[PDB]
């Protein structure tokens, strides 16, 4: 973080959605088709995981932005899946909508008036109005279509009026009101809706029975044949069709069933899939649950791990190469299928070849996303779900908590000669921990000395940052160069593009600085206080006063403490006025003191304040 | 996310109200210590009067609105002393519910009001009983929890950190951490 580098734009909100296949194909830097990663000699193979279009790799320049390994941010690519695959994360959902739909009229087997009742209640809940969603159930008039359509009209009329009335006042915005209680009422309904959807056996719209769908642990669906009672039901309801004019099921068949159902039941699904009103007016398509392409992350996030001398292959590239082998194989199977056919009859083999092609690519797709959804291979390679939940997870281990710069660790040693608000910093830490101090007229004298002193003499400086943004290390330089740079610190900027800026000096930690002292476990905020730095010569341990022993719950029995050196004035002010030791005399648990003298001082006081003491 | 809002109420990260006032009085625990130590405050009247400098505050606050209301609530409270909680008067609600504690001198918790008035009656002692009342009213004003204070983390830390001291076994009912877990 640089104060000389302000940011004018900011992220106000994050929107969660699904990438469309058409969207990925346009943004893609290169289509990945080759399972090999390197050509002979050592250059990356064209159409492979290490292609230079995905970013700079092996001292070569990127073939998209032209930059080298340092400045190139990396670029996304794509794998064209020869057949659509079920997205592992959304399989359970597409399964619910597959079991809930009629295979004839291609509507949900639940009565349209009941479905509309859920769509109405879910639309009113997009806006913060729960009372109105319950008041909809009060709207009431084997039932005729002319009567049921009037009920749908009266319900829609109340929904449109209740929204407009609340919209007129400050009850709900155009973007819709959303609270935890509103969310509770939404979650309850979306659950009840799917429960009613799955419960119906015989379709309420057209009285014909649909064949039940079963599932296994892996992403694969089967179709159980109808019983003789239900087969005869299809026959007797077969004539009314004319007047209007276990077996494995392929991914394409499921997508085609859901395609029509998501079109015919678009009204309810519009509110089932949108927490707040859909202002973008996007269509809720079934192909969101399916994957026709796979995005190839940039080479930057798929670099081969180097441990000493051995250079190990990246686990993601391995899983991606597997998807590429299967894709080339199905392209050949489809090419042979295209050749031949007059001769057929035994079509049990062509479907058997198809089932294998589909289940193999699906498994390779699953293995890449979530490994615990892929078949056992004679510990497997972790999927992207496993990467986000390795141990505590990416969110807990690398977002909520992080390893930090400008910080030190050491065994604490007692010291009654330092202030109760101070920390004894060893000179080892003082010559390494630096603060970016901007050079000005009021501190030119102080920083000139630090620059002359250099990175090994305290109080010195390890580096100097010019107004152009560049850094000048003082580490290798002798007293002569340092003296010259010090007389060049307050020189006016020739460049008009940086006249606003002034040089910075990365000066050693002085005795006026704030530091954050931490003793783990940090069970309460008093275990992380702000201490005043006191550099003590010829020291190899962090010196701490006895008054701090209580708050940190630290005993000098070989305990360790973390020292954090905040790098800006806002962070300084906070460690000196809010998290500072003196402002932590009383704990917020009971409002009682956690600061005081511990042993020798108590025995000394009883003797010093005694009547006999003159 | 739970913290103190600028409207003195305890609000969650998403603006949803959790409490209308911190502990029903808006007092910072790290301040509520000598707030009942009336004899101490009396012996150090001029020292604390110089601490809680009122000369730079008298133009920013109200000195009567809350004080008048405090008497009206005390009137109806004394009327239904022997009466049970369900039969108690609901005419006038507490002075803290109607007047901002940081803007009105006298909008104090009824617990503090009862304790302060009881001290002035049971102890007849150059400090007047009326000028001491103002100092304690002002002390309460200066003991308010700051808007922005993360009362949520502080609460969980105040329940967590001392629950480490009850890891030891019994020396019938469930105790310590297992009961706290229940």
């Amino acid at each position: 973080m640089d104060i000389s580098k302000p940011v004018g734009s900011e992220i106000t909100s994050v929107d969660f959605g699904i990438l469309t296949a058409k969207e990925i194909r346009n943004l893609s830097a290169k289509q990945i088709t080759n399972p090999t990663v390197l050509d002979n000699l050592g250059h990356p193979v064209s159409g492979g995981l290490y292609d230079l279009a995905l970013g700079a790799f092996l001292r070569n320049l990127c073939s998209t932005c032209g930059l080298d390994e340092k400045f190139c941010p990396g670029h996304q690519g794509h794998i064209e899946l020869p057949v659509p695959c079920y997205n592992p994360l959304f399989f359970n959902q597409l399964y619910i909508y597959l079991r809930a739909s009629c295979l004839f009229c291609h509507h949900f087997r639940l009565k349209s008036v009941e479905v509309h009742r859920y769509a109405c209640k879910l639309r009113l809940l997009q806006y913060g109005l729960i009372d109105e969603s319950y008041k909809l159930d009060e709207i009431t008039l084997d039932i005729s279509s002319t009567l049921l359509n009037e009920l749908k009209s009266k319900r829609s009329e109340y929904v449109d009026m209740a929204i407009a009335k609340a919209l007129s006042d400050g009850r709900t915005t155009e973007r819709g009101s959303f609270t935890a209680t509103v969310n509770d009422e939404r979650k309850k309904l979306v659950h009840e809706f799917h429960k009613k959807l799955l419960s119906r056996g015989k379709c309420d719209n057209c009285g014909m029975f649909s064949p039940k769908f079963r599932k296994d642990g892996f992403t694969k669906i089967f179709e159980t044949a109808l019983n003789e009672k239900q087969i005869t039901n299809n026959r007797v309801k077969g004539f009314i069709r004319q007047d209007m004019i276990s077996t494995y099921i392929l991914s394409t068949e499921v997508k085609n069933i859901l395609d029509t159902v998501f079109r015919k039941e678009q009204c309810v699904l519009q509110y089932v899939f949108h927490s707040r009103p859909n202002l973008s007016r996007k269509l809720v398509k079934a192909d969101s649950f399916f994957m026709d392409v796979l995005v190839v992350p940039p080479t930057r996030f798929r670099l081969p791990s180097k441990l000493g001398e051995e250079v190990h292959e990246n686990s993601q590239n391995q899983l991606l190469s597997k998807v590429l082998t299967t894709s080339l194989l199905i392209r050949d199977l489809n090419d042979d299928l295209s050749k031949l056919k007059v001769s057929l009859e035994d079509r049990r083999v062509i479907f058997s070849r198809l089932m294998n092609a589909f289940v193999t690519i699906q498994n390779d797709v699953n293995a890449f996303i979530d490994s615990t959804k892929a078949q056992g291979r004679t510990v497997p390679i972790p999927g992207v779900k496993q990467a986000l939940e390795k141990k505590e997870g990416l969110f807990r281990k690398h977002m909520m908590g992080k390893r930090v710069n400008y910080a030190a660790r050491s065994v604490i040693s007692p010291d009654p000669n330092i202030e109760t608000n101070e920390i004894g910093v060893p000179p080892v830490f003082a010559v390494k921990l630096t603060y970016p101090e901007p050079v000005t007229a009021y501190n030119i004298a102080e920083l000139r000395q630090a620059v002359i002193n250099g990175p090994d003499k305290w109080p010195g400086a390890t580096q100097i940052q010019n107004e152009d943004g560049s850094l000048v290390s003082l580490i290798g330089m002798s007293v002569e160069q340092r003296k010259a740079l010090a007389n060049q610190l307050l020189t006016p900027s020739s460049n008009v593009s940086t006249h606003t800026l002034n040089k910075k000096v990365y000066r050693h930690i002085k005795n006026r600085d704030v530091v954050l002292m931490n003793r783990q476990p940090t069970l309460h905020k008093a275990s992380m206080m702000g201490h005043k730095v006191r550099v003590l010569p010829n020291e190899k341990t962090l010196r701490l006063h006895y008054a701090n022993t209580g708050a940190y719950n630290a005993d000098f029995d070989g305990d360790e403490m973390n020292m954090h050196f905040p790098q800006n004035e806002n962070a300084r002010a906070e460690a000196l006025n809010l998290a500072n030791t003196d402002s932590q005399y009383l704990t917020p648990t009971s409002g009682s003191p956690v600061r005081g003298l511990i042993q020798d001082h108590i025995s000394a006081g009883v003797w010093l304040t005694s009547k006999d003491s003159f | 996310g739970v913290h103190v809002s600028y409207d003195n109420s305890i609000r969650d990260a998403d603006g949803t109200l959790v409490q209308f006032m911190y502990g029903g009085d808006a007092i910072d625990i790290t301040k509520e210590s000598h707030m009942t130590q009336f004899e101490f405050c009396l012996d150090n009247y001029y020292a604390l009067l110089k601490k809680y400098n009122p000369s730079a505050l008298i133009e920013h606050l109200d000195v009567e609105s809350a004080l008048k209301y405090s008497k009206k609530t005390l009137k109806y409270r004394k009327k239904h002393s022997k009466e049970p909680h369900y039969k108690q008067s609901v005419k006038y609600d507490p002075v803290l519910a109607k007047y901002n504690p940081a803007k009105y001198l006298g909008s104090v918790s009824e617990n503090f009001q009862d304790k302060l008035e009881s001290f002035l009656d049971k102890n007849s002692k150059g400090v007047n009983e009326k000028k001491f009342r103002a100092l304690m009213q002002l002390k309460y004003m200066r003991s308010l929890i700051n808007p922005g204070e993360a009362v949520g983390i502080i609460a969980s830390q105040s329940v967590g950190e001392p629950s480490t001291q009850m890891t030891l076994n019994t020396f019938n009912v469930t105790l310590g951490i297992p009961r706290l877990r229940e």
């Binding site: 505590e392 807990r396 281990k397 908590g401 660790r409 783990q520 476990p521 070989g558 360790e560 | -």
Partner: peptide, 28 residues
């Protein structure tokens, strides 16, 4: 045992691998 805890910079709060894991072994 305490010589190892002395150097380890904690990821989070202790861990529920005790009685808590068997109490969490119950669905809604």
């Amino acid at each position: 045992e305490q010589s190892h805890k002395k150097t380890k910079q904690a990821v989070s709060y202790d861990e529920p691998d005790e009685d808590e894991i068997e109490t969490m072994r119950e669905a809604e």
